Structure 1
């Protein structure tokens, strides 16, 4: 019901920008299309889409979570612009193997890793 309707709305919203966006930003984009969705709802939907692997999530330097619906389904990571949120989907096979061997070696189970590269793209570099 209001669950799948709103989920599609939020997902469709993400598909309109190539940049990572905070939940408040997404909420605003929806509010601009005349959507009656609340911020809390937007936040829950996004966190739900994140867990289902339908959108990627990452933290900004100031601790804020930002989201993005990415092109591939492949396991990947990102190089993000901390200024505009622009991002590049990146894969590092050697990082993957290193991350597995490190865990495997210290007897850790249910391994998960977070790898993200932050920088300032040329466009933003000239502010």
Structure 2
């Protein structure tokens, strides 16, 4: 995930950490991980970097049930939706044109100019139920 500004070891470290994992996580958890592996990088620095990348769209954003935003470097750059298990944190890339067509149809029927859609599905794995 390239950054608009000059690359620095802190930005490179947070980018390497983002590509290292595949689950959703907020600024605090990733700050904990990077400090523990030996990065020594700031909280506000990672917050600003994540804001910048979200503006660039290289990563995705998702507001949890409480409200805090979590982030994930998705392999697929095209339009897509994520199926997330809160117990595991795993994200599965799922895309469907049916929901997009439905959104466009209802927007046209209501005469709305633009449509921004948030479609999140929260569930639990089969292994989660098992013990």
Normalising by structure 2, report the TM-score.
0.84
Query: Could you tell me whether the CA contact under 8 Å between 1:60 and 1:82 is conserved in 2?
Result: no
Max radius of gyration: which structure?
2
The counterpart of 1:52, out of the listed 47, 52, 56, is 56
Q: Show CA shifts across 1:57-89 (max 9, x none).
A: 111112121111111111100110112211100
Unmatched 5+ stretches in structure 2: none
Q: Provide the C-alpha distance between the structure 2 equivalents of 1:3 and 1:37, rounded to a whole number of angstroms.
A: 15
* Contact 2:23 2:91 (8 Å CA) reproduced: yes
1:113 and 2:117 correspond: yes
Give the direction of change, closer, same or farther, for the CA distance of 1:48–1:104 in structure 2 (3 Å limit): farther
Aligned length: 127
Secondary structure, in 3 states, of the residue corresponding to 1:109? coil
Contact kept? 2:27, 2:43, Cα under 8 Å:
yes
Change (3 A) 1:95 1:30: same
CA deviations over 1:8-49 (Å, ceiling 9, x no partner): 322211111121111111111111232232112211211221
Q: What SS does the corresponding residue of 1:95 show, helix, strand or coil?
A: helix
User: How has the CA–CA distance of structure 1 residues 125 and 24 changed in structure 2, closer, same or farther, with 3 Å as cutoff?
Assistant: farther
Deviation for aligned residue 1:116: 1.0
CA distance in 1, matches of 2:104, 2:9: 39
| Residue ranges of structure 1 left out of the alignment (5+ in a row) | none
Q: Secondary structure of the residue that 2:114 maps to in structure 1? A: strand
Query: 1:36 is paired with a residue of what secondary structure?
Result: coil
| In structure 2, distance between residues paired with 1:59 and 1:42 | 17
Describe the shift of the 1:109–1:6 C-alpha distance in structure 2 as closer, same or farther (beyond 3 A).
Answer: farther
